[PDB]
A paper describes a structure:
Here, we report the atomic structures of an engineered diffocin, a contractile syringe-like molecular machine that kills the Gram-positive bacterium Clostridioides difficile. Captured in one pre-contraction and two post-contraction states, each structure fashions six proteins in the bacteria-targeting baseplate, two proteins in the energy-storing trunk, and a collar linking the sheath with the membrane-penetrating tube. Specific attachment of baseplate tail fibers to receptors on the surface of a target bacterial cell triggers conformational changes of the neighboring baseplate, which leads to reorientation of sheath proteins and contraction of the entire sheath assembly. Since the sheath and the tube are anchored together at the opposite end by the collar, collapsing the sheath pushes the tube through the baseplate, driving it to puncture the cell wall and underlying cytoplasmic membrane.
The diffocin baseplate has an inner section that connects to the tube and an outer section that connects to the sheath. The outer section of the baseplate consists of sheath initiator (CD1370) and triplex proteins (CD1371 and CD1372). The C-terminal region of Tri1, along with the tail fiber linked to it, was not resolved in the cryoEM maps. Notably, both Tri2A and Tri2B include a wing domain inserted between the core bundle and the trifurcation unit, reminiscent of gp6 in phage T412. These wing domains contribute to the interface with the hydrolase domain of the hub-hydrolase.
Author numbering:
A (entry chain D): 3 to 354
B (entry chain a), C (entry chain 7), D (entry chain 9), E (entry chain 5), F (entry chain I), G (entry chain P): 3 to 142
H (entry chain 1): 296 to 354
């Protein structure tokens, strides 16, 4: 504590930084000899100084973003001559939405694809990876196939630009889609015809295209191409999968936090849990992410099948008796929701 | 089919307020009152009505055992913030066909009873409220 | 956990008015009534409300033993100066979980009973009031 | 200190009206009702009041034995002149701490009962009034 | 910080008219009104004002108990002279901070009421005026 | 989406006048008015407009607890200067999204109230004005 | 044949202003007024008319939950530009025959409200305007 | 600002006197007699005046 300080400073006008975002966490894997281990980047100015300039430019590409910059960026650095599975094993603990590795060989790409699919299908954690040239048939991975992009007289390979693609996806609000979003920094791309681009989109690739006097994303589809009776076409859109994953994460969070191993498995507690889930869905409806008139309800058929499997005598039992029958430590539920999609095709017929 | 045993008795009623079970509840009540407008149509002698909406009204009565409502709403009511609650009512009579379990949402109370006692009289608290939404579970 | 013994009885109530214990008190009551305004929102069938404030109301009943209210307020009310008081109410039943002790502040009385007697009837006095504040002590 | 013997009984009440003692008095009552105005202050949720004045109200009931009220006010009420009276009320219970003796001044009656009888019923007269001033003698 | 008790009640006002106290006063008003001229400048959107002059207006209301106004005016208006008066108003609420005393000078009344009565109605007088200057004697 | 809780209540308003907080404020208004000129073209049926200028108007209402306005104006109008004032209004409801703070500048008042009282009525002051410019400090 | 259920209720209206949905709307008006000239002929008793032109008038009313109008107008009026707006109103009662959707174009607002609050009152905004043309999108 | 009974100090004093704290309700401890001693606690908040001002101007 010194004398009272009254200082008026004069300085030049400074450029205004792009606005931050509330959602979107990207995990980046890098190879450099120093500053190993996990690193955090909220602002583009705060980068480790000892890192190489090429890695710094990768991080800058990631932080480029969209209408909002991504919420935060997790950078994991390894020396080199180190297996990617060690980084994956460390990254299982953390939470993230999109993961990218600029310097992946085909073995690393295969390992990352297998890790992502195992996490989504077995570990029950909804995460995504942006990869260069992978023919994976899963909604988790996004296949970005566009080579030799020019960014200010510098050439970036197909694996190198996945950082910019992941940053662009993370910076998009939930209402919007990345279809036809233009890249001002890109100056040129290799020539491609309409038929080839259409076939590539039909095969499940996300590409760059020249249209309406700019370069923009052709379509926002993921790599899923084989459709089953229950999967459907709606699962091929990035926006739909994103909102579904958000819903899954929130519901699993509340369920784990408040009910697993916490209360006895009675019918009243099942009703309370139903009420909590319904209230969350109502909040989501108010936020305009999903359509109104969603329902949550005890699953009667699954409970009946489980009771039959357990060998109890289901005959001479009333519907209320089956509904409120004890079921050990299991809970059966079902719900119904509805989600919309953005405008992407328009037909205008004019009579002259 | 209609027997006097099937008439539901209020002794088999249970209430959950803000996720906690109340055991001193004495009575629970919730109703929707529709708003109607009279409309006279030329050539018709009988007057008809048009439906506008509803207002949810109800009340709770419970024995004075603990200061449940003070902790629920007092300090917030002073500070200028009005909380909203969810109530679950259950009615399961053993001699009835089934149970009835309704959830009442967006509940706003009408007052907060600080003190009410008279010599030689046991304690009771009445709490009216209003609501907007509801959901059906286990209908008959 | 709920037993019939745990209901608080009014016979175990005490009152301090202006710092002096009143032993002839019969009943005490204090009340805050919320002010609410109806608001109709487009696209919604149920009518909601907005909370605007509250009014504090209460009353005291006591046996006619001495001239307490006279000495408290008479001359000052005639002169044109209105006093304000503080009341403390305690409820402590040995069979209950615990005690309840609330202090009510900024009390302004509503009337002054000078004389009220009838042959063959014992004397009683009822005194309503208004208040704007309170504090919690010994909340169960 | 508080005993049931100390509660004043209304049988030990006496009234003087216009300087003469009434012996058929059945009940006497006089009260002051304050006038309050609600005032809302910015930033405060509790509504306060402002005290503006009072109105004095009372009544007398007595057995119908003599035409006391007719002689008091009838002819003057026709002629256009309204008289005013002074009443003294005393309450002295032998088992109480002391007596209570109040004088009510500037009394104006509300009506004059000419005839009221029903076969098989004893006679009674009720007379409400209003006043403005009062004085304290022998407080407790 | 403001209290409800600090609002001045009009029952505590007093009026002196030409040096004589007026006990039958009902209300008193006195206000100065400023005259403005709009200023508009070509090429600018906004409009501004400047003051030009001021004027004084007010009125009095009395209970009708005597012919005070006729004696005050007399034949002065009829004979062609120009009578002027001085009025002093005081407002002294015991619960407020202090008193407020103003002198209103150079009063010219607007009319004179000779008779205004109706069967079943109590009489009142209203007297508007204009004035030119004022002085403050007590500031609250 | 809209909630009924998000509507701003006027009890949560505050006012600063010439740098001093006004605790007895009752309401505050401020509004900009736009002047239009009608455009009519021969051969066309429609009518259009163009903006000409704008002006500002508003008013303040207070409880009468002191002589704030007379001190504020004083003798400035009488001597012939041109007093101008700055007012700041704030509206911060705890249940709304945020606050709203506006500065109203270059204020000229319309009149001055010296005395306005009546028996049995609580006092109030009303003060209209005009202004030229405004600034937004806090937006919502 | 008409039914009472076919009368449209105003709770089912919706408004878009400059492409953004307004969830706090309270009422909406829009009307076209025709101008007439009286024709009088010498030798004939009757009077006839011919149309001259038309003009558009309307208004909007909102609950006060944010500063929407100030952000919409901004400095456009102050900077001397001439802002115009487009409004779309929909009325879709489930019990009626169908929906009714109108687009109101070339809207010029009449004033801007900066602050209008009072203690104990919930806030509302009123915004009149004029327009020049309209389109029908859904006809019932 | 708040005022209330200092519970921890009362408990420490009662323990110092050697009374048994087991099988005792919280209200019993709170209302227990402490000879002639009284334990209280409170909370307030005091503001400071403007003394340092930092203004940054972009030209």
């Amino acid at each position: 504590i010194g004398l009272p300080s009254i200082n008026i400073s004069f300085k030049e006008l400074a450029t205004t930084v792009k606005e931050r975002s509330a959602r979107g966490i990207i995990a980046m894997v890098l190879k450099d000899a120093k500053a190993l281990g996990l690193n955090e980047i909220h602002e583009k100015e705060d980068i480790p100084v000892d890192l190489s300039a090429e890695n710094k430019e990768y991080i800058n590409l990631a932080l480029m973003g969209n209408v909002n910059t991504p919420n935060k960026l997790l950078v994991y650095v390894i020396e080199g001559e180190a297996d990617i599975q060690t980084a994956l094993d460390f990254l299982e603990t953390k939470e993230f939405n999109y993961l990218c590795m600029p310097k992946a060989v085909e073995a690393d790409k295969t390992a990352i694809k297998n890790w992502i699919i195992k996490l989504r299908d077995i570990d029950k954690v909804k995460v995504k990876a942006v990869l260069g040239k992978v023919v994976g048939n899963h909604e988790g991975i996004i296949n970005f196939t566009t080579e030799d992009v020019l960014v200010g007289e510098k050439k970036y390979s197909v694996d190198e630009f996945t950082s910019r693609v992941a940053g662009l996806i993370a910076g998009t609000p939930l209402s919007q889609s990345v279809t036809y979003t233009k890249l001002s920094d890109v100056v040129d791309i290799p020539k491609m015809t309409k038929v080839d681009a259409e076939s590539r989109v039909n095969k499940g690739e996300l590409i760059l295209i020249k249209e309406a006097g700019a370069i923009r994303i052709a379509r926002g589809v993921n790599s899923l191409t084989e459709l089953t009776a229950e999967k459907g076409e709606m699962f091929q859109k990035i926006k739909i999968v994103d909102t579904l994953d958000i819903i899954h994460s929130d519901i699993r969070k509340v369920i784990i936090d408040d009910y697993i191993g916490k209360v006895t498995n009675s019918y009243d507690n099942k009703c309370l849990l139903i009420v909590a889930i319904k209230s969350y869905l109502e909040e989501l409806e108010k936020s305009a992410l999903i359509e109104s008139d969603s329902t949550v309800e005890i699953d009667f058929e699954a409970q009946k099948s489980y009771l039959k499997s357990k060998g109890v005598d289901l005959s001479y039992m009333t519907l209320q008796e089956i509904k409120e029958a004890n079921t050990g430590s299991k809970v059966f539920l079902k719900a119904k929701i509805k989600v919309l999609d953005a405008m992407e095709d328009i037909d205008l017929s004019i009579e002259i | 089919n209609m027997e006097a045993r099937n008439v539901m008795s209020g002794t088999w009623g249970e209430l959950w307020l803000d996720g906690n079970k109340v055991a001193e509840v004495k009575k629970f009540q919730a109703k929707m009152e529709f708003t109607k407008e009279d409309i006279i149509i030329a050539g018709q002698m009988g007057t008809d009505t048009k439906y506008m909406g509803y207002k949810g009204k109800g009340s709770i009565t419970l024995y004075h055992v603990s200061s449940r409502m003070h902790k629920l709403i007092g300090e917030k009511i002073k500070r200028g913030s009005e909380p909203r609650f969810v109530a679950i009512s259950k009615l399961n009579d053993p001699d009835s066909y089934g149970a009835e379990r309704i959830a009442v949402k967006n509940i706003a109370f009408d007052d907060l009873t600080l003190a009410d006692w008279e010599v030689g009289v046991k304690g009771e608290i009445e709490a009216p409220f209003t609501f907007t939404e509801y959901d059906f579970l286990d209908i008959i």
